[PDB]
């Protein structure tokens, strides 16, 4: 049984060795599952599977964070693989951005600066 806090403080190589050890142990437990086997031994199958899942989660999260940090640079930001870009929605991706809209012509800017909306009260 592996603890997530201890897992997060390890390198890739140690994580891979632990992954191999746990896979080997589960493969051994399947043999017991086939040839009779006692309840105390069969009760170990679930914790091992969840430990494997934990190790794989840590590995993949580290990999994704590193790759995003790599492609953060403006030189390579235009070649980011589409699996690392923000998903949102098809239509939101295709819609006009706030900067793209909200532009006006020179005449409209000048008129809005000459005649702004006022605050007033009536007595």
């Amino acid at each position: 049984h592996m603890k997530i806090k201890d897992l997060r403080e390890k390198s890739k190589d140690d994580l891979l060795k632990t992954l191999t050890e746990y896979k080997k142990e589960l493969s051994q437990l399947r043999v017991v599952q086939q040839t009779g086997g006692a309840e105390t031994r069969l009760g170990r199958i679930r914790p091992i599977r969840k430990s494997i899942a934990r190790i794989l989660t840590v590995l993949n999260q580290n990999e994704r964070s590193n790759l995003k940090m790599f492609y953060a640079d403006r030189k390579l930001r235009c070649k980011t693989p589409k699996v690392l870009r923000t998903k949102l929605t098809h239509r939101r991706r295709l819609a006009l951005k706030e900067n793209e809209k909200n532009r006006k012509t020179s005449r409209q800017m000048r008129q809005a600066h000459k005649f702004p909306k006022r605050v007033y009260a009536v007595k």
């Binding site: 819609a95 006009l96 793209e100 809209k101 532009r103 006006k104």
Partner: protein, 203 residues
């Protein structure tokens, strides 16, 4: 400017020189495809007044349609029911050829936005219109405040819903007042207004 000379010249379609030019162009056009892409419009003044600019997102195509009336598509020319619905050759379509041309181009090329069109040439078999379309994914288009209204998705297939000038013409929205009361905002809208049965609460 030069616009006045081009306009006054194109208002003389029956003169000898204009007839010669149109005859050469018609011969040339009828040996091409049904849809053709152009680099520049054939009538720059008309295109500009209809909304085309010499920019990076505007394109021009030329589309062809067949002249004449409509034949009812019934097997062997046989109809059934009341005799008043028995014509096969004398009926006419309720939509004009300019709108049909715009719809054909729009159905074929789905990544563009159809803006307007104008009459270019005519024949005994064919009619030719030129269609203005813009690309909604171009940065120039998206940043120009005078055309970037067309990037919104409520303008996706205007020609299929009849929101172009030719569609408005055959819908009847060239008139107001007492000549258009039964067709505003649409025939179906007027029908619903005039025909739904109303139940007030405390009637």
């Amino acid at each position: 400017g030069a616009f006045m000379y081009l306009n006054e010249l194109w208002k003389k379609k029956s003169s000898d020189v204009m007839r010669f030019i149109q005859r050469i162009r018609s011969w040339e056009f009828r040996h091409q495809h049904t849809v053709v892409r152009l680099r520049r419009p054939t009538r720059p003044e008309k295109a500009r007044m209809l909304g085309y600019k010499t920019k990076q997102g505007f394109c021009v195509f030329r589309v062809r349609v067949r002249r004449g009336g409509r034949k009812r598509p019934v097997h062997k020319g046989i109809t059934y029911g009341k005799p008043k619905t028995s014509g096969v050759l004398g009926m006419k379509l309720n939509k004009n050829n300019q709108a049909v041309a715009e719809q054909r181009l729009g159905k074929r090329f789905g990544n563009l936005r159809v803006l307007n069109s104008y009459w270019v040439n005519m024949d005994s078999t064919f009619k030719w219109y030129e269609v203005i379309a813009v690309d909604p994914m171009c940065k120039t288009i998206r940043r120009d405040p005078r055309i970037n209204w067309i990037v919104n998705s409520v303008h996706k297939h205007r020609e299929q819903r009849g929101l172009t000038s030719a569609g408005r013409k055959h819908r009847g929205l060239r008139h107001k007042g007492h000549k258009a009361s039964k067709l505003r905002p649409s025939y179906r809208a007027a029908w619903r207004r005039n025909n739904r049965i109303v139940f007030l609460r405390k009637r």
